[PDB]
Amino acid sequence: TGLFINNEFVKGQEGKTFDVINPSDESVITQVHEATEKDVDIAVAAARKAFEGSWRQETPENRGKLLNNLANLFEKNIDLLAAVESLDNGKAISMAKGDISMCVGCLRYYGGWADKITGKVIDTTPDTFNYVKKEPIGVCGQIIPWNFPLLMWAWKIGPAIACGNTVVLKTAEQTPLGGLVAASLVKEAGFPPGVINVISGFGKVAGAALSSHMDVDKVAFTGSTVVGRTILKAAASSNLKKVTLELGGKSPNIVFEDADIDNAISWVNFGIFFNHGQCCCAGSRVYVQESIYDKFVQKFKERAQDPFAADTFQGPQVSKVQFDRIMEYIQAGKDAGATVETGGKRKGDKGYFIEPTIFSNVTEDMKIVKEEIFGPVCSIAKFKTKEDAIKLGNASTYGLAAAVHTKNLNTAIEVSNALKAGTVWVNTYNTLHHQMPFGGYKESGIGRELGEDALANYTQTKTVSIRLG
Amino acid sequence: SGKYEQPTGLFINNEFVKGQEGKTFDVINPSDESVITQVHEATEKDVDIAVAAARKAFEGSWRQETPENRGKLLNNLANLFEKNIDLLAAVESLDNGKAISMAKGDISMCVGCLRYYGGWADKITGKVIDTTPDTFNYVKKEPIGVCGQIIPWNFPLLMWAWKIGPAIACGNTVVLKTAEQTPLGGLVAASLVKEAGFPPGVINVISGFGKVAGAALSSHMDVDKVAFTGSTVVGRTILKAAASSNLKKVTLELGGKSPNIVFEDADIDNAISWVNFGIFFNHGQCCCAGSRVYVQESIYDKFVQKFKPQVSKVQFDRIMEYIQAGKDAGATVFIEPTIFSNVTEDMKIVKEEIFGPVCSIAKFKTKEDAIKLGNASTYGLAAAVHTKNLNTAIEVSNALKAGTVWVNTYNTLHHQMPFGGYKESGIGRELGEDALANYTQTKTVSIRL
Amino acid sequence: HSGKYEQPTGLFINNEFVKGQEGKTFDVINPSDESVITQVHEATEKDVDIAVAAARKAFEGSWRQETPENRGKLLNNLANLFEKNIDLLAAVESLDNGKAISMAKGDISMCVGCLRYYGGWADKITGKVIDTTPDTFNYVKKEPIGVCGQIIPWNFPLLMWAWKIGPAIACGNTVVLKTAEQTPLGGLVAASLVKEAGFPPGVINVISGFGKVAGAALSSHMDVDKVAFTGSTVVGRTILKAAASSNLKKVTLELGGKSPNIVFEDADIDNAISWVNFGIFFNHGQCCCAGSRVYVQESIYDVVGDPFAADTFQGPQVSKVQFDRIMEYIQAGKDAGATVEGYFIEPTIFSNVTEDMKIVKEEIFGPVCSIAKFKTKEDAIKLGNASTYGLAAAVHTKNLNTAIEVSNALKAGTVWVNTYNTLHHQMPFGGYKESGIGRELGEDALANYTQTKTVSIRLG
Amino acid sequence: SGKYEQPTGLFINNEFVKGQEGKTFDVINPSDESVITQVHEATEKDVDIAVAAARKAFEGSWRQETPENRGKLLNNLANLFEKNIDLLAAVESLDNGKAISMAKGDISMCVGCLRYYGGWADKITGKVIDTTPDTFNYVKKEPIGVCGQIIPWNFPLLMWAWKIGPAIACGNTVVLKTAEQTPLGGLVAASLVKEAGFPPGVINVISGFGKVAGAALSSHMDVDKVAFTGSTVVGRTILKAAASSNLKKVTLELGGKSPNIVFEDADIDNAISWVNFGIFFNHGQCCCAGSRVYVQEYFIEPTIFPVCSIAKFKTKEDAIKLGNASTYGLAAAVHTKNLNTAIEVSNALKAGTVWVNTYNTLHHQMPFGGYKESGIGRELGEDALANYTQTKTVSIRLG
């Protein structure tokens, strides 16, 4: 399926195609047209033509109408879309239905916001009139990863289109299929040509080309810190465009004395093993109070024990490079003397399946504890003081999210007030919602994403001061 | 008067001190050209001391304090500023070289600015979201932490007040670096910081150069955010080191070249008075300045006739470079305020950033031509429109590609109204409630049942 | 005009069409041919009690499970239903109220936009968190008020329906709406949509009755938590006094006012006479916001009947009482020496209204306009602002200083500049002084339909 | 101490003046029963004067004034409250009968209160709506105009300071009436009003009785707003008069039966101290005081089952029904350590202020206000400004 430009599926100016492999049986699904720097420039040129006197005319009332249209389409095709994702990405299809649900709530939630962006009328002290507009930024290019390609698709598209920007989305080469079938829905929903363009390519070729584009007004990156620094470096070399990143971090999971146990093991099971641990906020450092530690760890072990089947909860990892980094991390974790409760071996000759991995007898500064593994691999420890879980859990330059299980409100408030995370879950984990914003503290991110906060990043403030008598 | 100062130190932990290297770097008066005196120097080893102070303050001291007495500090400081307005006005006139007449204007604007933000200390509010039943979700604002702030020299004390107000309101400790050309202001201000009873390390004021101290802040691993004012190229400098270091947050306000538009029905007596105040106010040192001025094809000639100290040698030299490029371009034409006319459309003299008293006049016909001409610029920091027609005034201001638009006024700026750029003029707006967004972080707590 | 007919006549209680306990019917007249359409059942004080009980059961039970997402979803369903039956609905509207079916369709469009908007607001109602405490945590919750009684007026029965129902349901309140005696039909047709949309039983109830019997019952009810009145100021005073004698329920009023129209010499050539035409003769002059008195600078001082037809712009008046009230008022206009230019009264224009007599004294609510003449600027502010009513006003000009200064100076809850009688859900509509209590459109409606709640948690 | 008399009059147009009736009324000391002195009394014509003054102030002076200055003025007045905190602290104790320590505590709250709203004067923001068409619409906020403000006796200067804070922040002129029992406070405050530099007639302080002076404010044709604190039945009478007059905005605060709920999982030491404060604080003379308390299975001495009633629930749902089975719900409290208990029960309680592991701590930043018969409008924190502002919507059609 070709590049989505001006509501058409053109093909690559140089005709490059690149290969799409299925993680379940390693076979090759098909090939997808590749954008190079000439493609990116013409895409961006389409976005700007739309921005210029086309979609500036459209009314917020309608911009929401369109978004709601898109969400109903998504909803009309939950089954196709969840399949595409399971094929391309490798996720349990009952899980994939979950993911599209989140897409229909996220788009529709931003549908509501389109007509509710408002500036201010500042009563300046003198006898003058001053209004503060919020306007669209213009061309917004976003790069999304392959954890939640369709979900991340809908995060980026939503905000930008509610506010009235025109966008250019690059799908990660790993999972370029979803964003394209979504793009087909974008034509049924009644969006002008140009408003929304979807690109497939690599970070190093198109990815970059977006970042350095002198006619791109905003980039919005979701992936590894490493590439993020690249992206920041790109914006600075080009036109100083507005950047907002959501890098990943190795978040923690914390259990207390008073806390309920059966929910903990279940939520911390979900906290690391959800999406195979292939999500930004997974809970790889698990900390339990010493009193409860031994039995908890036993009770955690027992809980640990094809995507298209309905029984599966885990699945293939996205690529063998990503598989072979995960496997390099597990051997590193054992090479360091850490015991293994359960974990350490692939499943089956075909496919990238990896087992849920646990580690004990681990020190505070192994390679595995505070460097992003990005698979189903986690660490357990014993803490005793309230101030311990603080010094321990935040002993970390990556603070994207955290958790705290307790029954004592004072502990809950104090710890969560003390924790240095963009998101704190009390008695839950890995539950995101569009209403509440999501982002990285310090090195996990630059800017916040869900909620009304997203909107800030895609609007901007003009001060008009009508001075007179 | 002029006076003789004591340790001209780095303000560190509420104390003036020197550099561990023992280095110093002269300060010179643009009027006389004599050297006023000599101010201490801060290099990487000192910035790491100051960052240590700010993080020390931030941890356990200032987290206990409340926004009402935090507020109760930014007013005291505003009071000190007013008590010694004419003193600070003098220093600032002496060092920068601007007329003591800015005693009220510039140095009071700080009092206003620091007061307003003193206001905002206890008005910071998080959120509560009604996601569902059973669950209970809220959003809270917290202080970012240590902030590096680099100011220029055009409004040394003003800028000083624009960076302390929001940062402190929100509850963050700061480490400030004055310019090399005009460090004197921040240091007296610093004595005022001690007086108003701030606890030690919530404000450290540093002196130095871009190549050394500047760099140390930008790339400092323990700095959580940085905010910067000055040339676009040093901004790009900041953004990179941010990226290499620790992805600390970056707010830039870079200067821009900014237009002034006059229509036939503009009440000419007002229009000429604003454009002149717009371009020459503070020698053209204003980031937002009427670098290029445009007049209707009907009233151009009538309009033109009615119309007719930098900080160091180097700033004095780029204007003489750009003035030379002017006559070279063939364009009809302390420092003489310079004016050019029948300047072409594509020149050096228009498109890059003079930062001195020079102005270039252009002539338009239709309304949409002034749109094409104004927003035809890489720099979009401010713009202004002088007319009387309603439909004209609001249609154009919407169209103009700038972060501040002025209608029947120029260079008149207020602290409750946000000021910023959006065409590589800047990242983020820094005045009014929106500044407080830059120096806070969001944390989301969800409780289940 | 469309043969299909399913005009329900019952009271819409608990997602059902019941009948009056003591069974009273009351006649419905068509203002175009003075004929009786049919008869609708009447609520009385036991009906209203039953009703309030329905709403309160809903609010007490069903709406702990429901998430703001779904409250938003439902309104959108109800919008799409409204938009699927624009044609049927416009027809009832036109038949019942006697207004051109071109206008009635315009009305319903406004309904679907108003419902959608508020559907968008359900998940976006966020309370605050106050972080200025030491070793304490305080959040401020917003929550539904509870049971909200609504009394809509016959000008725009279906529009007013949406204006009331939208905000209240977004926030999580449950409501009981009394239609106007003169136009009960729309609200009941709508009520049928409310069940197809998937609202729970009880959440939304539509009563027919009178301002006296039923109207009083809602406003004096001790289990009704908030009434919302729209209509004559004489009734509003009754509504407040009801609320004070009963249980102090929170009360939002939106009464009428005599709105000014100002025209400045620099202003604009023909669309001005076009806007002021629309300004007083839109909807036959039945809008609270209509521009009764028109003011012009001295320099420049000097459609028929059947609603179901296409060419019509102006239609019947609601009834003979309204017709008769109008005739008395214009009769007084000629009686006072002012020059002059089934149910349908042709639009009159009064000059020589040099003074502020009876014709400019109070609202008329018919197609009667009054012309004034001004010449400075501070006089038009003083002539316009010279009224106990301040709900809307207009200015026409080309002039920026006059525009802003005047509209700053005018004392109306809404001020149009170079336009008139153009409302929009985004922006709040409301009255100054004796015109109103509260604000209605936009985000400010939501305040009227939520309560805050301060939780403070001590630590240590 | 006790001191000179001076006029002791009506504060009108920045000067102490006297009743046109020539009526004076007596002030009694709750402690020794003595008669302190005689303050004059307002009647319908003094009110009409003061309203006239507040209108002429509003109609001219205040335009020239800029929110930056409003705020300066309010904290100036907060500065002066702090100057004579000790004086004003004692006035209040002599007049009302309240421990001098508590009066330091009350004044601090006033200075706080006034300062906060000083903060808010230049932060009043309007809206700008991006209307679908090519129009340009904004939403302005303007002052209502003349306000009537009626205070009880329990926090005569505290309440004084909540009432004038928001009102002046937003740009209104106020006309304040002081309770008959305790007018002494307000009148010094009024001396401090001139000194803080307020233009004349922006704050007028009236003394007099419920019937006469109340009625005059409530029903005054040229008052645009009233605000009321005290019994429910004078409230009803205020609402009613509003209606018969010309439809003032009415914001009222009524005092009620608040509850205190303690599960035995709560810490008993903190619980006991907090309920004791709660009900014996300010001699149970506060709207917030928690008349009834439930646990899990002239001077009047303190009383228990300034009174209180104890009873005992079992499961959690009885705790919520007992607290909310009341005509009244102005405040509440709940003492526990259970997270899920504290969040769930407080949502379920129909109160305008809930306290968890604390009672009667009240902060000017946080809005205080009443449910059901407890009040109409909330009046503290940011939300107060809403009560004293008013929305104007301008649409500008374009080409």
Residue numbers in the entry:
A (entry chain D): 18 to 322, 328 to 491
B (entry chain A): 11 to 318, 338 to 362, 375 to 490
C (entry chain B): 10 to 311, 325 to 363, 373 to 491
D (entry chain C): 11 to 307, 374 to 381, 398 to 491
Quote the study that presented this structure, word for word.
Many protein families have numerous members listed in databases as allergens; however, some allergen database entries, herein called “orphan allergens”, are members of large families of which all other members are not allergens. Three orphan allergens [Cladosporium herbarum aldehyde dehydrogenase (ChALDH), Alternaria alternata ALDH (AaALDH), and C. herbarum mannitol dehydrogenase (ChMDH)] were recombinantly produced and purified for structure characterization and for clinical skin prick testing (SPT) in mold allergic participants. Diffraction quality crystals of ChALDH and ChMDH were obtained, and their X-ray crystal structures were determined by molecular replacement. Examination of the X-ray crystal structures of ChALDH and ChMDH and a homology structure model of AaALDH did not identify any discernable epitopes that distinguish these putative orphan allergens from their non-allergenic protein relatives.
